[PDB]
Amino acid sequence: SDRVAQLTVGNSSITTQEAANIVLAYGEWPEYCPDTDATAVDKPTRPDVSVNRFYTLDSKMWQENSTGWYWKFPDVLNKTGVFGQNAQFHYLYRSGFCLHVQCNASKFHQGALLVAVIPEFVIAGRGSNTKPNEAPHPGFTTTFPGTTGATFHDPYVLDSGVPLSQALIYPHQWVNLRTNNCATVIVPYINAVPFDSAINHSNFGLVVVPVSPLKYSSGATTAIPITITIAPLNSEFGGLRQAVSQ
Amino acid sequence: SDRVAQLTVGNSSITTQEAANIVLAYGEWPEYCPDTDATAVDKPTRPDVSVNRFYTLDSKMWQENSTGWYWKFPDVLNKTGVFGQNAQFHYLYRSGFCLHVQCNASKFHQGALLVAVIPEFVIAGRGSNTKPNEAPHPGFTTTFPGTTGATFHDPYVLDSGVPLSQALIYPHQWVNLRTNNCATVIVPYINAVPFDSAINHSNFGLVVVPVSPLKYSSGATTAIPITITIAPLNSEFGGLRQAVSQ
Amino acid sequence: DPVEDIIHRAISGATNVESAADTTPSSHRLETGRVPALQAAETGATSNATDENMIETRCVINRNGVLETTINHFFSRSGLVGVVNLTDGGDTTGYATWDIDIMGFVQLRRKCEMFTYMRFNAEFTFVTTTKSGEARPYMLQYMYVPPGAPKPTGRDAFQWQTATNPSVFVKLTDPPAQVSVPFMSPASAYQWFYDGYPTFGQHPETSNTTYGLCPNNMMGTFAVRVVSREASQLKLQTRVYMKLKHVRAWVPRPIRSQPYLLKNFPNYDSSKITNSARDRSSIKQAN
Amino acid sequence: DPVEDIIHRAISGATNVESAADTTPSSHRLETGRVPALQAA
Amino acid sequence: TNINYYKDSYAASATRQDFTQDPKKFTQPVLDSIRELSAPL
Numbered sequence: 001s002d003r004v005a006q007l008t009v010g011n012s013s014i015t016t017q018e019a020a021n022i023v024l025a026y027g028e029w030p031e032y033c034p035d036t037d038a039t040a041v042d043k044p045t046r047p048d049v050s051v052n053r054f055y056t057l058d059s060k061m062w063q064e065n066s067t068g069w070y071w072k073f074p075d076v077l078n079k080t081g082v083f084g085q086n087a088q089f090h091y092l093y094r095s096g097f098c099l100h101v102q103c104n105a106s107k108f109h110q111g112a113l114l115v116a117v118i119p120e121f122v123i124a125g126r127g128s129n130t131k132p133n134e135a136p137h138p139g140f141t142t143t144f145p146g147t148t149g150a151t152f153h154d155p156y157v158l159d160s161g162v163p164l165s166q167a168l169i170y171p172h173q174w175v176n177l178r179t180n181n182c183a184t185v186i187v188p189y190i191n192a193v194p195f196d197s198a199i200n201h202s203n204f205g206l207v208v209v210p211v212s213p214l215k216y217s218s219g220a221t222t223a224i225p226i227t228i229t230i231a232p233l234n235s236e237f238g239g240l241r242q243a244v245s246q
Numbered sequence: 247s248d249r250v251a252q253l254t255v256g257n258s259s260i261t262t263q264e265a266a267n268i269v270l271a272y273g274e275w276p277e278y279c280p281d282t283d284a285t286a287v288d289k290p291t292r293p294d295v296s297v298n299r300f301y302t303l304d305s306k307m308w309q310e311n312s313t314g315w316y317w318k319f320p321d322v323l324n325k326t327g328v329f330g331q332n333a334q335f336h337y338l339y340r341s342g343f344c345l346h347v348q349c350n351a352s353k354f355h356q357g358a359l360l361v362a363v364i365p366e367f368v369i370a371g372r373g374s375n376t377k378p379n380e381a382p383h384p385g386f387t388t389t390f391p392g393t394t395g396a397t398f399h400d401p402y403v404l405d406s407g408v409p410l411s412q413a414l415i416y417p418h419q420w421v422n423l424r425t426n427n428c429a430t431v432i433v434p435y436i437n438a439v440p441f442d443s444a445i446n447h448s449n450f451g452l453v454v455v456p457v458s459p460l461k462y463s464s465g466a467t468t469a470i471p472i473t474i475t476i477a478p479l480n481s482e483f484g485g486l487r488q489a490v491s492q
Numbered sequence: 493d494p495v496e497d498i499i500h501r502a503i504s505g506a507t508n509v510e511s512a513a514d515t516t517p518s519s520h521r522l523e524t525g526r527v528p529a530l531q532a533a534e535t536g537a538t539s540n541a542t543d544e545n546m547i548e549t550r551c552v553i554n555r556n557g558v559l560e561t562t563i564n565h566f567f568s569r570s571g572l573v574g575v576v577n578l579t580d581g582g583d584t585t586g587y588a589t590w591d592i593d594i595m596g597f598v599q600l601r602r603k604c605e606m607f608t609y610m611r612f613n614a615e616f617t618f619v620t621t622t623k624s625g626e627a628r629p630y631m632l633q634y635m636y637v638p639p640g641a642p643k644p645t646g647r648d649a650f651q652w653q654t655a656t657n658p659s660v661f662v663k664l665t666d667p668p669a670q671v672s673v674p675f676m677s678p679a680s681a682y683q684w685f686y687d688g689y690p691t692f693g694q695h696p697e698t699s700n701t702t703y704g705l706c707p708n709n710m711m712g713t714f715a716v717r718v719v720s721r722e723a724s725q726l727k728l729q730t731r732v733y734m735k736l737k738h739v740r741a742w743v744p745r746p747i748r749s750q751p752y753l754l755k756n757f758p759n760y761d762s763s764k765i766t767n768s769a770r771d772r773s774s775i776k777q778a779n
Numbered sequence: 780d781p782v783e784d785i786i787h788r789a790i791s792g793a794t795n796v797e798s799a800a801d802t803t804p805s806s807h808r809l810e811t812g813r814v815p816a817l818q819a820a
Numbered sequence: 821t822n823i824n825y826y827k828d829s830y831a832a833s834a835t836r837q838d839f840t841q842d843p844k845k846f847t848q849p850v851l852d853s854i855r856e857l858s859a860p861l
């Protein structure tokens with residue numbers, strides 16, 4: 001009863017047998033911006049079914065030595081779908097996301113992944129240089145990896161210089177191969193401003209880090225893909241202009 | 247709750263752990279013939295517990311290449327039990343059947359059988375001859391195989407020249423080794439006449455056809471028997487005379 | 493009361509539906525343990541998943557008519573159940589006889605064989621002409637010969653007096669002849685598949701030709717001549733069409749996949765099995 | 780009304796707590812299907 | 821409002837049309853009602 005579940009948004013639907021409940025981040029639902037909180041005076045557009053729906057990205061193959069991956073959400077969807085086209089033609093953006101991570105495996109496999117939504121996730125430079133002018137900075141494509149995602153060098157600090165053990169202070173869910181085959185989290189829109197640009201700013205990141213490694217026996221299936229599905233939810237756009245993708 | 251179930255009729259009982267619901271053909275229960283529908287004026291006999299009860303037939307061993315089997319119901323039971331003796335001494339017959347098919351297998355086996363009750367199932371001759379006098383006709387023992395049952399030559403057409411894909415238009419149930427270990431269907435008496443002879447006419451056939459073949463791994467149990475159990479239900483007989491078995 | 497044990501519904505019901513079903517507006521659902529998508533095909537019940545549950549739909553009030561699909565409009569169309577060849581000039585001959593079977597050939601046979609039991613009335617129409625298609629002012633006689641009535645043994649036979657057997661006299665240039673027929677079976681329904689034998693006794697495993705035949709479907713014979721004392725020299729062909737009306741149908745079944753080899757028997761040729769489908773290039777490329 | 784589809788909380792709440800929580804006396808329990816210890820992380 | 825010119829009722833026309841459906845007997849011939857929104861097993 002609680003294990004089984006089905007979502008639906010737009011024309012897309014997801015069904016799960018073995019799922020464990022659902023995480024609603026910070027106890028609030030996504031909403032449209034209220035009149036009091038609004039600032040920009042133009043009438044925002046609310047596409048609904050054309051934008052809000054599940055989008056599936058390419059799959060990551062999880063291997064015994066895998067170090068984990070991450071994504072930036074008002075990034076991955078900027079070049080894909082109708083959501084991506086509204087984002088390039090509009091200067092202002094607001095929405096929440098419903099997030100779903102999926103990893104199958106047999107009852108003979110063992111391991112655990114930590115799925116976490118970590119707002120304002122800022123990757124850092126890796127090096128001992130204390131001089132600000134010569135200090136390393138983490139690339140463009142490492143900061144906004146796009147649809148393909150990026151992988152951690154040293155997941156223990158989350159590339160942020162911050163302990164992964166405390167990452168449970170963020171909306172998070174475990175996917176444990178013996179318990180559940182998927183993790184689901186709904187994130188309301190959070191930021192210091194009512195709207196914000198989609199192409200410049202990344203509200204929050206996602207982190208799938210293999211805490212307990214992947215282990216199995218000879219003869220079992222070796223290839224274990226990981227797939228993420230994200231639904232932009234309760235979207236808004238404003239500030240229409242010509243397309244700027246970068 | 248829905249998985250587990252137990253039937254009972256007569257002095258016989260069946261219990262199932264993994265069963266999936268029950269099929270009641272054409273949404274009607276077996277009944278005795280009403281006064282309006284009756285024609286023959288003699289008082290029919292209603293043996294009840296001596297006739298109505300579960301009868302188990304010999305088991306079929308299902309092998310990787312198995313092509314399927316079939317039976318004819320007011321046939322298989324004509325030579326067995328007290329039901330068979332009433333059928334030989336009486337000219338008229340009416341009853342419904344409660345039907346149960348049983349195939350065990352491990353969670354490491356895979357395959358699927360299609361159990362179907364197909365009224366007025368008429369096997370056909372196999373050959374290209376268009377001349378009616380030289381055309382082949384399908385034997386006596388192929389038409390009424392008796393308790394031992396008969397096997398299909400080419401199950402894809404069901405020996406009837408009719409596509410098996412459409413066999414789902416008949417009261418039917420799948421037994422899928424990963425889901426359920428047995429299939430159960432109750433069939434009311436159907437025919438164009440209130441009573442009909444048991445030894446001449448076969449109301450309906452049963453078809454167990456291995457759609458997806460049987461597959462397993464070395465070291466697993468090879469022998470996978472299939473057993474069918476049939477309960478003549480709500481029986482009636484009439485037209486008493488000396489025994490005619492053929 | 494002296495002994496206790498001697499002291500001792502359905503499922504669904506039919507709804508009258510005049511038009512196709514509508515659609516009601518729905519929205520996204522996110523919650524647990526409510527899943528219209530997951531079904532079990534093993535139970536033998538078809539998926540009850542609807543539109544409104546799977547994705548978001550608008551409010552659609554459907555005016556499309558469902559009427560044309562009733563079985564009573566599906567058989568309202570006439571078809572050719574038999575064609576009989578009459579040559580009055582050849583040798584002696586003089587009459588033609590056609591035993592009534594609507595399985596004679598395909599299109600109408602394939603329709604009626606998707607139900608096991610059918611009860612209905614019928615309407616026969618007789619289109620007669622010359623081998624050349626031309627019409628000539630000759631009078632014809634169509635006599636129906638119920639089971640057990642003596643068949644005509646010649647053009648001059650006394651069988652044609654028809655004090656009982658119903659007849660139709662019509663000239664050949666006139667419009668076709670048309671009659672209504674009731675439901676004449678001795679049973680309560682026609683049945684196109686009978687698994688069993690008409691008689692008791694031994695059933696050889698060499699020639700079973702008795703098998704499959706249902707006597708309740710034998711309606712007798714239809715005979716035709718041309719009325720004169722002297723034998724006319726002409727060739728003639730009579731096509732028989734039948735509407736099928738006031739129809740009821742029971743326990744549907746699949747259509748014929750394979751070409752019909754014989755009239756009374758569902759035989760096919762096992763080497764030629766057609767694999768009803770069209771061949772393709774691998775999978776995962778659609779045309 | 781001309782077209783229908785155009786026709787269209789949180790979870791918890793905050794409690795004012797001035798002092799730390801108290802503790803209430805409990806005793807042994809022996810029965811089935813009541814298990815505060817088993818959790819799902 | 822049809823008409824019959826003979827006293828034998830089987831000679832009549834298509835008579836009156838009708839709309840009747842109970843696909844429930846073919847679609848769902850099961851003895852335990854399956855709620856369409858809930859898990860079958």
Ligand SMILES: CCCCCCCCCCCCC/C=C/[C@H](O)[C@H](N)CO
Pocket residue numbers: 592593594595614616634635636658659660671673676682709710711714756
């Ligand atoms: C003046 C001629 C009138 C002819 C009236 C005869 C009507 C016959 C009753 C309708 C046909 C019954 C259905 C036929 C059964 C099958 O074709 C075969 N008997 C079985 O193979």
